Design an enzyme around this catalytic site. Structure first.
Site, PDB file in Angstrom:
ATOM      1  N   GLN A  11       0.820  -1.204   0.000  1.00  0.00           N
ATOM      2  CA  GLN A  11       0.000   0.000   0.000  1.00  0.00           C
ATOM      3  C   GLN A  11       0.856   1.256   0.000  1.00  0.00           C
ATOM      4  O   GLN A  11       0.712   2.112  -0.878  1.00  0.00           O
ATOM      5  CB  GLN A  11      -0.943   0.017   1.198  1.00  0.00           C
ATOM      6  CG  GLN A  11      -1.770   1.285   1.255  1.00  0.00           C
ATOM      7  CD  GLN A  11      -2.826   1.250   2.329  1.00  0.00           C
ATOM      8  OE1 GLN A  11      -2.915   0.295   3.093  1.00  0.00           O
ATOM      9  NE2 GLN A  11      -3.639   2.296   2.393  1.00  0.00           N
ATOM     10  N   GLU A  63      -4.020  -6.018  -2.844  1.00  0.00           N
ATOM     11  CA  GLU A  63      -5.303  -5.424  -2.469  1.00  0.00           C
ATOM     12  C   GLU A  63      -5.890  -4.701  -3.668  1.00  0.00           C
ATOM     13  O   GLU A  63      -5.281  -3.731  -4.160  1.00  0.00           O
ATOM     14  CB  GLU A  63      -5.138  -4.448  -1.302  1.00  0.00           C
ATOM     15  CG  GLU A  63      -4.758  -5.088   0.020  1.00  0.00           C
ATOM     16  CD  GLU A  63      -3.897  -4.183   0.887  1.00  0.00           C
ATOM     17  OE1 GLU A  63      -2.832  -3.731   0.417  1.00  0.00           O
ATOM     18  OE2 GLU A  63      -4.281  -3.932   2.046  1.00  0.00           O
ATOM     19  N   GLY A 136       2.520  -7.433   5.099  1.00  0.00           N
ATOM     20  CA  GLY A 136       2.698  -8.696   4.418  1.00  0.00           C
ATOM     21  C   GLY A 136       3.080  -8.501   2.970  1.00  0.00           C
ATOM     22  O   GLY A 136       4.004  -9.146   2.471  1.00  0.00           O
ATOM     23  N   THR A 137       2.371  -7.608   2.282  1.00  0.00           N
ATOM     24  CA  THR A 137       2.685  -7.335   0.885  1.00  0.00           C
ATOM     25  C   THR A 137       4.030  -6.635   0.758  1.00  0.00           C
ATOM     26  O   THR A 137       4.893  -7.059  -0.018  1.00  0.00           O
ATOM     27  CB  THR A 137       1.584  -6.489   0.252  1.00  0.00           C
ATOM     28  OG1 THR A 137       0.303  -6.980   0.662  1.00  0.00           O
ATOM     29  CG2 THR A 137       1.682  -6.548  -1.256  1.00  0.00           C
ATOM     30  N   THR A 171       1.402   1.466  13.794  1.00  0.00           N
ATOM     31  CA  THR A 171       0.033   1.093  13.476  1.00  0.00           C
ATOM     32  C   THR A 171      -0.159  -0.413  13.377  1.00  0.00           C
ATOM     33  O   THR A 171      -1.119  -0.864  12.744  1.00  0.00           O
ATOM     34  CB  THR A 171      -0.394   1.751  12.166  1.00  0.00           C
ATOM     35  OG1 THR A 171       0.197   1.051  11.066  1.00  0.00           O
ATOM     36  CG2 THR A 171       0.074   3.190  12.135  1.00  0.00           C
ATOM     37  N   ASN A 198       7.673   6.914   9.440  1.00  0.00           N
ATOM     38  CA  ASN A 198       6.464   7.727   9.393  1.00  0.00           C
ATOM     39  C   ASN A 198       6.432   8.755  10.512  1.00  0.00           C
ATOM     40  O   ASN A 198       5.784   9.798  10.374  1.00  0.00           O
ATOM     41  CB  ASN A 198       5.230   6.836   9.460  1.00  0.00           C
ATOM     42  CG  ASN A 198       5.056   6.004   8.219  1.00  0.00           C
ATOM     43  OD1 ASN A 198       4.763   6.526   7.147  1.00  0.00           O
ATOM     44  ND2 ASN A 198       5.234   4.698   8.355  1.00  0.00           N
ATOM     45  N   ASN A 220       3.791  11.570   1.656  1.00  0.00           N
ATOM     46  CA  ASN A 220       4.124  11.138   0.308  1.00  0.00           C
ATOM     47  C   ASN A 220       4.555  12.309  -0.564  1.00  0.00           C
ATOM     48  O   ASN A 220       5.407  12.152  -1.446  1.00  0.00           O
ATOM     49  CB  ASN A 220       2.930  10.440  -0.314  1.00  0.00           C
ATOM     50  CG  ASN A 220       2.421   9.301   0.538  1.00  0.00           C
ATOM     51  OD1 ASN A 220       3.190   8.626   1.254  1.00  0.00           O
ATOM     52  ND2 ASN A 220       1.111   9.043   0.434  1.00  0.00           N
ATOM     53  N   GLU A 246      27.783   6.504 -10.119  1.00  0.00           N
ATOM     54  CA  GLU A 246      28.632   7.434  -9.382  1.00  0.00           C
ATOM     55  C   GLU A 246      28.148   7.616  -7.956  1.00  0.00           C
ATOM     56  O   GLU A 246      28.938   7.945  -7.066  1.00  0.00           O
ATOM     57  CB  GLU A 246      28.668   8.793 -10.083  1.00  0.00           C
ATOM     58  CG  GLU A 246      29.589   8.867 -11.280  1.00  0.00           C
ATOM     59  CD  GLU A 246      30.086  10.274 -11.543  1.00  0.00           C
ATOM     60  OE1 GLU A 246      29.352  11.232 -11.229  1.00  0.00           O
ATOM     61  OE2 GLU A 246      31.214  10.423 -12.060  1.00  0.00           O
TER      62      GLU A 246
HETATM   63  N1  LIG Z   1       4.937   7.420   4.252  1.00  0.00           N
HETATM   64  C1  LIG Z   1       3.736   6.620   4.113  1.00  0.00           C
HETATM   65  N2  LIG Z   1       3.590   5.369   4.899  1.00  0.00           N
HETATM   66  C2  LIG Z   1       2.363   4.541   4.769  1.00  0.00           C
HETATM   67  C3  LIG Z   1       1.356   4.931   3.909  1.00  0.00           C
HETATM   68  N3  LIG Z   1       0.382   4.023   3.981  1.00  0.00           N
HETATM   69  C4  LIG Z   1       0.762   3.064   4.869  1.00  0.00           C
HETATM   70  N4  LIG Z   1       1.993   3.402   5.345  1.00  0.00           N
HETATM   71  C5  LIG Z   1       2.689   2.577   6.326  1.00  0.00           C
HETATM   72  O1  LIG Z   1       2.926   1.089   5.757  1.00  0.00           O
HETATM   73  C6  LIG Z   1       3.005   0.304   6.802  1.00  0.00           C
HETATM   74  C7  LIG Z   1       2.044  -0.921   6.618  1.00  0.00           C
HETATM   75  O2  LIG Z   1       2.273  -1.467   5.379  1.00  0.00           O
HETATM   76  P1  LIG Z   1       1.035  -1.451   4.303  1.00  0.00           P
HETATM   77  O3  LIG Z   1       1.562  -1.093   2.934  1.00  0.00           O
HETATM   78  O4  LIG Z   1      -0.036  -0.459   4.751  1.00  0.00           O
HETATM   79  O5  LIG Z   1       0.399  -2.977   4.225  1.00  0.00           O
HETATM   80  P2  LIG Z   1       1.184  -4.096   3.304  1.00  0.00           P
HETATM   81  O6  LIG Z   1       2.668  -3.920   3.503  1.00  0.00           O
HETATM   82  O7  LIG Z   1       0.824  -3.840   1.852  1.00  0.00           O
HETATM   83  O8  LIG Z   1       0.684  -5.606   3.752  1.00  0.00           O
HETATM   84  P3  LIG Z   1      -0.910  -6.018   3.614  1.00  0.00           P
HETATM   85  O9  LIG Z   1      -1.703  -5.165   4.578  1.00  0.00           O
HETATM   86  O10 LIG Z   1      -1.104  -7.484   3.924  1.00  0.00           O
HETATM   87  O11 LIG Z   1      -1.370  -5.717   2.203  1.00  0.00           O
HETATM   88  C8  LIG Z   1       2.552   1.135   7.995  1.00  0.00           C
HETATM   89  O12 LIG Z   1       3.629   1.472   8.757  1.00  0.00           O
HETATM   90  C9  LIG Z   1       1.941   2.400   7.352  1.00  0.00           C
HETATM   91  O13 LIG Z   1       2.053   3.562   8.273  1.00  0.00           O
HETATM   92  C10 LIG Z   1       1.500   6.231   3.087  1.00  0.00           C
HETATM   93  O14 LIG Z   1       0.626   6.561   2.352  1.00  0.00           O
HETATM   94  N5  LIG Z   1       2.689   7.042   3.211  1.00  0.00           N
HETATM   95 MG   LIG Z   2      -1.103  -3.794   3.127  1.00  0.00          MG
END
Ligand SMILES: Nc1nc2c(ncn2[C@@H]2O[C@H](COP(=O)(O)OP(=O)(O)OP(=O)(O)O)[C@@H](O)[C@H]2O)c(=O)[nH]1
Ligand SMILES: [Mg+2]
EC number: 3.6.5.-
Lengths: 431, 67
Positions: A11, A63, A136-137, A171, A198, A220, A246
């Site tokens: 995500q 997702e 996980g992803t 989180t 974060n 972001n 470089e």
């Molecule tokens: N800088 C930033 N961090 C994010 C954002 N969205 C989620 N995170 C962080 O990503 C971490 C969780 O990973 P996610 O990408 O949300 O979930 P995943 O890694 O895809 O694993 P699944 O939930 O099984 O799909 C958390 O620490 C979030 O705070 C964003 O838009 N910007």
């Molecule tokens: Mg996720």
């Protein structure tokens, strides 16, 4: 010619991808409908036979609920629909599902895109990975994907911009585990690994931008301003051009030590820019400032082994070498003995661009610092502590082992941190 | 070996003036010619310029000749 392949996993990977790719379409006048009113963009796009410029990136996730937004938002005519790879079910914040259950059947669909994406660039500078360690992803697939990229390409440069678990703000509850397991797979497979948390970017939103309502759509927007300042030399003319090769050459002393921090400057609202002058010497002082770091680490606990500097705007080298000369005299800033040098500096005549409705200020000078310091061994130890705090009870284990794993994977990935800890004091030998 | 006046015994009385098909500071030595090789050999047409490579993988033969 000077072409790179950007990846987005999980995500956060695509939620930063919606920021970077909102920036480039804007930094080259690319309308959301692909087209516009050479080589200024050829780093990131590819003309088709009909007008359009399609980006050379990959949004990958398990997702549909985050990928379909891209398919419905204003930036839907941009991407080739095949590049936006999704999945039926998600990994459910579990390193196993991203590594053993689900990740195994989609990689071939991803790789066939990468291969179709490699031929379309004549000279490949290196891969860019936007990972999110803690899910996980992000962690499970990023692990599995980075390996396969090493077999198919080998020594090609893969950068890593992976958000890391923060000490306080967290989180998740299981994010200790899927972070540890990820390390070995990134360590042995990624070429360079920039890190950022974060939380660290929250306070920067607090003091500097003074937005008491910060969300992810704000953070972001910051990383976009980093990479644009980092790859300007790939697509914008400027003295002291600096490419990826470089970049890692004079920044990574040993094959192991490839973790580093980031700092942008200046970070100012649209009104204090009127109470200000923003000299090149002032900016670079706020760049080495610990409070302007994008990681919750302390540089005054360790030593700088190397630093990189991408300046941007009305800047001349006579001013770079002058301000850098001051910092070398500053005692607050240490340097490990075996680098009397320690700066690779870059300049770009193209100032950063501001997004309409953005929070930064239109400025004609900016600095993005990246330093490989040994103080980063701190943020790397808290994970060592919490992991062992829970793993001494086998808590949450029945999930991991229940999805095609065993217990050995914990001890391996545990020691891989232990060994990596001492390296961050070995290099601080001072003899 | 009379009627020959050999080089090993020709006092500086006897001496020759060199003539054109011979290098000397007075007349100009006009340009010469050499062969310049094909180029860097490859499996496609040989080129003079070296290019990047996407699949590095030490000891492997992968190129993109078509660009
Ligand atoms: N800088 C930033 N961090 C994010 C954002 N969205 C989620 N995170 C962080 O990503 C971490 C969780 O990973 P996610 O990408 O949300 O979930 P995943 O890694 O895809 O694993 P699944 O939930 O099984 O799909 C958390 O620490 C979030 O705070 C964003 O838009 N910007
Ligand atoms: Mg996720």
């Amino acid at each position: 010619m000077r072409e790179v392949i950007s990846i987005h996993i999980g995500q956060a990977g695509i939620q930063v991808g919606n920021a970077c790719w909102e920036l480039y379409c804007l930094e080259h006048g690319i309308q959301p409908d692909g087209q516009m009113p050479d080589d200024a963009f050829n780093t990131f796009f590819s003309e088709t036979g009909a007008g359009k410029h399609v980006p050379r990136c990959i949004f990958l996730d398990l997702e549909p609920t985050v990928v379909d937004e891209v398919r419905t938002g204003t930036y839907r005519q941009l991407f080739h629909p095949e590049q936006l790879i999704s999945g039926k079910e998600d990994a459910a914040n579990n390193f196993a599902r991203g590594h053993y259950t689900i990740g195994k059947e989609i990689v071939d669909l991803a790789l066939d895109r990468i291969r179709k994406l490699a031929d379309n660039c004549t000279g490949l500078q290196g891969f860019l990975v936007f990972n999110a360690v803690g899910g996980g992803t992000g962690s499970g697939l990023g692990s599995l994907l980075l390996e396969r990229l090493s077999v198919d390409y080998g020594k090609k440069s893969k950068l890593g911009f992976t958000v890391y678990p923060s000490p306080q703000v967290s989180t998740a509850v299981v994010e200790p585990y899927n972070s540890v397991l990820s390390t070995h797979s990134l360590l042995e497979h990624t070429d360079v690994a920039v890190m950022l948390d974060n939380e660290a970017i929250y306070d920067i939103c607090r003091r500097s931008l003074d937005i008491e309502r910060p969300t992810y759509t704000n953070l972001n927007r910051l990383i976009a301003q980093v990479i644009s300042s980092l790859t300007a030399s790939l697509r914008f003319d400027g003295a002291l051009n600096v490419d990826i090769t470089e970049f890692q050459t004079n920044l990574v002393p040993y094959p192991r030590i490839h973790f580093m921090l980031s700092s942008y400057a200046p970070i100012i609202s649209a009104e204090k820019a009127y109470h200000e002058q923003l000299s090149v010497a002032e900016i670079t002082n706020a760049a080495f400032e610990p409070a302007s770091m994008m990681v919750k680490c302390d540089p005054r606990h360790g030593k700088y082994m190397a630093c990189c500097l991408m300046y941007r705007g009305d800047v001349v080298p006579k001013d770079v070498n002058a301000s850098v000369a001051t910092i070398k005299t500053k005692r607050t800033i240490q340097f490990v003995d075996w680098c009397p040098t320690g700066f690779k500096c870059g300049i770009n005549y193209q100032p950063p661009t501001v997004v309409p409705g953005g929070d930064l200020a239109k400025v004609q000078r900016a600095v993005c610092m990246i330093s490989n310091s040994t103080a980063i061994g701190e943020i790397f130890s808290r994970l060592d502590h919490k992991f062992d705090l829970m793993y001494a009870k086998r808590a949450f284990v029945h999930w991991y082992v229940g999805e095609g794993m065993e217990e050995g994977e914990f001890s391996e990935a545990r020691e891989d941190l232990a060994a990596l800890e001492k390296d961050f004091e070995e290099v601080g030998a001072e003899s | 070996k009379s009627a020959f006046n050999f080089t090993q015994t020709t006092p500086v009385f006897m001496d020759s003036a060199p003539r054109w098909p011979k290098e000397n500071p007075t007349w100009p030595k006009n340009m010469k010619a050499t062969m310049g090789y094909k180029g860097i050999q490859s499996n496609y047409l040989p080129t003079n310029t070296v290019t990047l490579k996407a699949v590095e993988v030490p000891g492997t033969t992968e190129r993109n000749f078509n660009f």
